């Protein structure tokens, strides 16, 4: 039994700032939710394969959360302190406690390439996001590049992402969107993130054995 309280699976696995006081447990038979948990994806967007993720996390025999890319050390040439008023906590703007909004630093957004190797002798759950701003003037101000790319390469997951700019209806005070994607990484496999903009990089991941 895993009680998420008033948080959805999305808000809990992404690390919504208003769900940090959820007691983590390494083994659960099923997940108990509520009729409509108040806190889900504080930043609007499409959660890819959400139902498949809820099925994959239904029951777990081992579950450890770990820092996959340390914030202070992984992106020295990119700004890392991005926060939003949508994902607020104690009345102050913050972001997902498992993600990182990389933006430009000193007028530049250099090409990044970050690898993670699954040395946990388990399968790790990795989550990231692709940012879809609402206009080109925001794309320039945030990243200083106009034609952004985001690619993820693993043995069993490889995809070139489409960071398209589009003004969507204002939800939670935002006309832009963050599309959330995820994959399960087998032991020994290496996932590689490459981007010149619009990447919501993974900060923490989850090593799980999935009983």
């Amino acid at each position, epitope marked *: 039994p895993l009680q998420l309280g008033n948080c959805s699976v999305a808000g809990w696995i992404l690390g919504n700032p208003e769900c940090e006081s959820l007691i983590s447990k390494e083994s659960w038979s099923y997940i108990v939710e509520t009729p409509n948990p108040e806190n889900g994806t504080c930043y609007p967007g499409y959660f890819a394969d959400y139902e498949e993720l809820r099925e994959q996390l239904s029951s777990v025999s081992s579950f450890e959360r770990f820092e996959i890319f340390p914030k202070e050390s992984s992106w020295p040439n990119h700004t890392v302190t991005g*926060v939003t*008023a*949508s994902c607020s906590h104690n009345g*102050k*703007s913050s972001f997902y406690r498992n993600l990182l909004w990389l933006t430009e630093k*000193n*007028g530049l957004y250099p090409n990044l390439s970050n690898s993670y190797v699954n040395n946990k002798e388990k399968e790790v759950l990795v989550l990231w996001g692709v940012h879809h701003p609402s206009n080109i*003037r925001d794309q320039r*101000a945030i990243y*200083h590049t106009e034609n952004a790319y985001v690619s993820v390469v693993s043995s069993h997951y490889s995809r070139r992402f489409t960071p398209e700019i589009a003004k969507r209806p204002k939800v939670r005070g935002q006309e832009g969107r963050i599309n959330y994607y995820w994959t399960l990484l087998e032991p020994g496999d290496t996932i590689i993130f490459e981007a010149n903009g619009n990447l919501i990089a993974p900060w923490y991941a989850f090593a799980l054995s999935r009983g």
Partner: antibody
């Protein structure tokens, strides 16, 4: 309406200190960032510094002209923004204005939505 | 720092444009704001977010940007428009912060 009123300017010797004040009225002060600008007599607009709203950390940014010497703070209980100036030099002599501004959401930059200004106060760094 | 024409002259009722050239750091990728400052007065916000207008600004004032330079347009020229005009923006370089243009004095002819 929105109204920003400034005070504190006056004669001050080089090397001394002087604390400017900017009182806000007619809007929720805690929801806006605040910026100080200055303008030497007949010599164009210059940026002094900027303080974010409490929602965005209440942190500050400063011009290279000023960073080590001036300190910007705010008091949301009294809806007042301050410009604490130290180690003043003669080239700091200018009319100083205060403004309200938006804090951009993700990059936390000032939006430069300086829709409302104070009347300004003159600071003479002289001996 | 941004560069503006020191003076701009135009007759009433004419199209008048003020240039503000910058770099990719400041004007290329950041928003530009335009200000009007009549002699000895607090500046007035004409344009923000490269073309948006705050409340009270008439439709005669417009702004545009293309690459590294930004431009402000005033279409129905009045004698009240005779003032100084500044362009401001953020410079994403390490500690350049808010940068401005030198200023442009608009004189109405006739």
């Amino acid at each position: 309406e929105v109204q920003l009123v400034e005070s504190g300017g006056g004669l001050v010797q080089p090397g001394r200190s002087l604390r400017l004040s900017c009182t806000a009225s007619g809007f929720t002060f805690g929801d806006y960032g605040m910026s100080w600008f200055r303008q030497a007599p007949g010599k164009g607009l210059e940026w002094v510094g900027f303080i974010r709203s409490k929602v965005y950390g209440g942190t500050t940014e400063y011009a290279a002209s000023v960073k080590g010497r001036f300190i910007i703070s705010r008091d949301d209980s009294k809806s007042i923004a301050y410009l604490q100036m130290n180690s003043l030099k003669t080239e700091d002599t200018a009319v100083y204005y205060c403004t309200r501004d938006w804090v951009r959401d993700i990059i936390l930059l000032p939006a430069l939505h300086l829709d409302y200004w104070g009347q300004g106060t003159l600071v003479t760094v002289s001996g | 720092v941004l560069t503006q024409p020191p003076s701009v002259s135009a007759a009433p009722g004419q199209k008048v444009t003020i240039s503000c050239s910058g770099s990719s750091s400041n004007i290329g990728n950041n928003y530009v704001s335009w200000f009007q400052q009549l002699p000895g007065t607090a500046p007035k916000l004409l344009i923000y977010d490269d073309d948006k207008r705050p409340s009270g600004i008439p439709d005669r004032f417009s702004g545009s940007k293309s690459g590294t330079s930004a431009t402000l347009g005033i279409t129905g020229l009045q004698t009240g428009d005779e003032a100084d005009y500044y362009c401001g923006t953020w410079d994403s370089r390490l500690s350049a912060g808010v940068v401005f243009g030198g200023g442009t004095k608009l004189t109405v002819l006739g």
